[PDB]
Amino acid sequence: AKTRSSRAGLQFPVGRVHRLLRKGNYSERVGAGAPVYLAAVLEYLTAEILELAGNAARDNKKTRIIPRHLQLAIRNDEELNKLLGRVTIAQGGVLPNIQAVLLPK
Template sequence: MPRQNFRVPMDAGGKIKKGAEGRKEGGPKKKPVIHFVRAGLQFSVGIIGCYLKKGRHSQCIRIDAPVYLTAVLEYLAAKVLELLVGNVAHDNKKNKIIPRHLVVRNDEELGRLLVGVTTHGGVLPNINPVLLPKKTDRAPKRA
């Protein structure tokens, strides 16, 4: 039995419609949008999704679970860095944030959230005034 040739139907313009272009009357194909850009996030949804799948937390993971978890992680990171650490570094007139500035215990909500996770580190930077260099008051000399 010979093979039959199936021809792709052509529209009035003579163009062959392929894939996604056929749905929109031959318009230009849209560029794909990454998950975290679509959700308006900075952290990568794909990486969080990979960690969820590797972790074997469940047999099935819903499509929106990595997006939600990424949003929660980004919120917590922003809160810790901007509100807590940034304020402590600014109060001590520092430009760089060091691990000593991470004072999670002073914040009520984060202290309760991370009570079993963090150690007792992250104390407020406090230097005994005796150890600081003495300031001398020199009056400007007038001629």
Template sequence: MTSTSKKTRLSRSTRAGIIFPVARIHRHLKACPTAPKRITKGASVYLASVLEYLVAEFLELSGNAARDCQRSRIIPRHILLAYANDEELFKLLRHCVVPQGGILPNVHLAAFLDKNQDDSSLPNTSISREKKKMKKKIASSTATNVKINIRKPTLAKKGQGSFSVTGTPATKAAALQGTAVTTLSERVLVR
């Protein structure tokens, strides 16, 4: 007589050796409206492992940022600093907005330029080379700008209690014609 031994049931996550739920991810993949009709079991295991790796990377970098700020709790600011200071994660998430994350500390090099400062007085460092480049860019851009004399429009009375501006162009695009400004879209209010 053979005895039937019950095997303990293992989840797909345990069999794959990961923490993220493989079955739940498979269910969500199937429920996605843009997904094909058939999804393999390997696809959900692969996606779960990739998600687990990304979350582990985020938590490690965010924990390091929290520790650098002498904090024991990870806040959205630490998450922002974590992915912004990592080159590969920043490439992946450069258009993401972290609510309550703030902005990255950054000072534009043009703020350090002094208009009357001579280039020869700057030491030969990487920051001074950047300053010299910015100064040249600013000088070249201001030299090409053309000053346009625009006279003030006059008011003309049309009807009872209403004034309209005469001498103004009908559209914004007509007003900016001949300048370096390009109008991508225009919203007109109907009066």
């Protein structure tokens, strides 16, 4: 185990995150555990979105995740929709939602 990612059991790069934290003027000093924690959190959120986006692609008979699948995934999940509430997903569209009073009686 030479990499800091293997040492933490992560797929996300602990070394690169530690670099960006230092080259970012966030504080004078960056602890050794901070990049590890962050890369894991970044990895968890990444998995959470790709899980719901791969499901959306499968519902649309697609093997590839296109931006609409990310939009359907985020806007259908309550917490993902809140985390990206002030975010615009390019080529994502909107959720199908027609108001009731517009329906014919």
